Design a protein around this ligand. Structure first.
Ligand SMILES: CC1(C)CN=C(N2CCN(c3ncnc4sc(C(F)(F)C(F)(F)F)cc34)CC2)S1
Length: 464
C-alpha cells in the first residue's frame, strides 16, 4: 500500500540510507509510521537480536519490507470495518479507537515476558505477535493512520502512553496496560488520573504528539542492547543520527525525554560540531518549562545523572533538589511507584555513595568539596523537603524509617560548622514541608540527634 515515491530509496544498505528514508518521510505531509517502524524493527532485529551472518548492515530489500507492510495493513483493514463507525467531521469516535485497540490486543501472544527488549516495533508485532506496553499504544496510532484517521495521536507521560483523538484532539482514550498487576482502564479517559494530580498523568501536562513527534518516539524506542554488557554500535549510531535529524527539523522542541536521550548518546560518543551534553540536558529542562509547566521530573533526573557520573557532587545535588521541587506539588498515588523507586534509589543509594566517596576525598585533602559547601547542604535539605511536601495530602505515605537511617548518615557527612551556615527562613533556604520545618533546630547540632530526626521524618509517635 506504499506509494511509488516511498519505494525509491530501497534497498537500504546502510545507516545513512535509513536516515535518508526518515528524512524523506519527514518531508512528507504525513510520515508513514507503519513503514518507518517496520524498517527500524527489521534493522534492530538483525543488529541486536540475531547478528548471525552480519557483515556490515542488514540490507532492507523493498520486497521484504513491502511484504511486512502488507501483512500489517491487511490485518488492520480486514478486522476494522470503518463503515460501522461513521466519522462525523474528519474526527474519529471512541468506539472506533476502542475497536482498533482491541484488534491490536487480541493479536498478541496469550503469554510472554512483557518487559523484554526488542518487542517495541511493528516488526515485533508482525513476526513475533509481541508488543510492550507503549508498543501497543504506538501500534494503535500506526493502525489508525493506516486507516486514514488523521486525528488519532499518541499521548505520553513519563511512565505511560495512550491516545488523543476526536473534535479538536480533545478526547483521551486508554489503549494499553500500565505496569504489572494494575487493572487496565482501556477505552476510558485519563481524566480521573489528571484530577487526582498523580505523577502518572502529569496534572495534564503530558505530551500530545503530532505525527513528527510520533516519529521521534519510535526513534527514542530503538534499543541497541545486545545483552547486559554489550550494545550495538550500529544501532547507537543510527539512533543518534536520527535524533539529530529530528532535532534539526524542530521535532524535539516539545520532547524533553528525547533531548535527554540525545544528550546521553553524545556523552557516550560526541558528534563533532554539536552542542555538549550539558547544553542538551538544559534544553530538555527548558522544553519542560516552556511547554509542560515545568511539571516533568525526568529532565532534572537526566541532568543529575550526568553530574553524578562525572562526580560533579554539587551540581548533582542541585539537580536532585530541583527534581524534588517538581514532585512536591503532586499527590503520590497508586500507579506512581516507578518515580517512588527513582527517588528511593537517589536518597538511599546514590547520594550515600556519592557522599561516602566525597568524605574519603576530603580526608585526602580535597578543596572546594561539596561537603564543605553550605550551598550543597542546602540542596540536600531541599531534596528532602520536596519529598516530604510530596507526601503531604497524598493518599499513600512516602517516608518510612528505611529513609531515616540514610538521612541521618547523609546529614552527618557535613560537619556542624558547615551545617550552621545555612539560614532557614520562614545560603538561604525556605522549607515548604512541615516535616522539614520541625527538623530545623536538629539540622545544626554538632552531634546530630539521630533518634529525634527519625521521629521527625516518620512522624513516629512513640519510642521503646
Ligand atoms: C533520567 C532517567 C532516569 C533515565 N532514563 C529515563 N527514561 C528513559 C527513556 N524514556 C522515554 N524516552 C522517550 N520517550 C518516552 S515515552 C515514555 C513513556 F511514556 F513512559 C512510555 F511510553 F510509557 F514508555 C518513556 C520515554 C523513559 C524515561 S528517565
Amino acid at each position: 500500500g506504499l506509494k511509488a515515491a516511498q519505494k525509491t530509496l530501497f534497498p537500504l544498505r546502510s545507516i545513512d540510507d535509513v536516515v535518508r528514508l526518515f528524512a524523506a518521510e519527514l518531508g512528507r505531509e504525513e510520515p508513514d509510521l507503519v513503514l518507518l517502524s517496520l524498517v527500524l524493527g527489521f534493522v534492530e532485529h538483525f543488529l541486536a537480536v540475531n547478528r548471525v551472518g552480519l557483515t556490515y548492515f542488514p540490507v532492507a530489500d523493498l520486497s521484504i519490507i513491502a511484504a511486512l507492510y502488507a501483512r500489517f495493513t491487511a490485518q488492520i483493514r480486514g478486522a476494522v470495518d470503518l463503515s460501522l463507525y461513521p466519522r462525523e467531521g474528519g474526527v474519529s469516535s471512541r468506539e472506533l479507537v476502542k475497536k482498533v485497540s482491541d484488534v491490536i490486543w487480541n493479536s498478541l501472544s496469550r503469554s510472554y515476558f512483557k518487559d523484554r527488549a526488542h518487542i517495541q516495533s511493528l516488526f515485533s508485532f508482525i513476526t513475533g505477535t509481541k508488543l510492550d506496553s507503549s508498543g501497543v499504544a504506538f501500534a494503535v496510532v500506526g493502525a489508525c493512520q493506516a486507516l486514514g484517521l488523521r486525528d488519532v495521536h499518541l499521548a505520553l507521560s513519563e511512565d505511560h502512553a495512550w491516545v488523543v483523538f476526536g473534535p479538536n484532539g480533545e478526547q483521551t482514550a486508554e489503549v494499553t496496560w500500565h505496569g504489572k498487576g494494575n487493572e487496565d482502564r482501556r477505552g476510558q479517559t485519563v481524566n480521573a488520573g489528571v484530577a487526582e494530580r498523580s505523577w502518572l498523568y502529569l496534572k495534564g501536562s503530558y505530551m500530545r504528539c503530532d505525527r513528527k513527534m510520533e516519529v521521534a518516539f519510535m526513534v527514542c524506542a530503538i534499543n541497541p542492547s545486545i545483552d547486559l554488557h554489550t550494545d550495538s554500535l550500529e544501532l547507537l549510531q543510527l539512533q543518534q543520527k536520527l535524533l539529530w535529524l529530528l532535532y534539526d527539523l524542530g521535532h524535539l522542541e516539545r520532547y524533553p525525554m528525547a533531548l535527554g536521550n540525545l544528550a546521553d548518546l553524545e556523552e557516550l560518543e560526541p558528534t563533532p560540531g554539536r552542542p555538549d551534553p550539558l547544553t542538551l540536558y538544559h534544553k530538555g529542562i527548558a522544553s519542560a518549562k516552556t511547554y509542560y509547566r515545568d511539571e516533568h521530573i525526568y529532565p532534572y533526573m537526566y541532568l543529575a545523572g550526568y553530574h553524578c557520573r562525572n562526580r560533579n557532587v554539587r551540581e548533582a545535588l542541585q539537580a536532585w533538589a530541583d527534581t524534588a521541587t517538581v514532585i512536591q506539588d503532586y499527590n503520590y498515588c497508586r500507579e506512581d511507584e516507578e518515580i517512588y523507586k527513582e527517588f528511593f534509589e537517589v536518597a538511599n543509594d546514590v547520594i550515600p555513595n556519592l557522599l561516602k566517596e566525597a568524605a574519603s576525598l576530603l580526608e585526602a585533602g580535597s578543596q572546594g568539596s561539596a561537603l564543605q559547601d553550605p550551598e550543597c547542604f542546602a540542596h540536600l535539605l531541599r531534596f528532602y523537603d520536596g519529598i516530604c511536601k510530596w507526601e503531604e495530602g497524598s493518599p499513600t505515605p512516602v517516608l518510612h524509617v528505611g529513609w531515616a537511617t540514610f538521612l541521618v548518615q547523609s546529614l552527618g557527612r557535613f560537619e556542624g560548622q558547615v551545617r550552621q551556615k545555612v539560614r532557614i527562613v520562614s545560603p538561604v533556604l525556605t522549607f515548604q514541608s512541615e516535616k522539614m520545618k520541625g527538623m530545623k533546630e536538629l539540622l545544626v547540632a554538632t552531634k546530630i540527634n539521630s533518634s529525634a530526626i527519625k521521629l521527625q521524618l516518620t512522624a513516629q509517635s512513640q519510642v521503646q
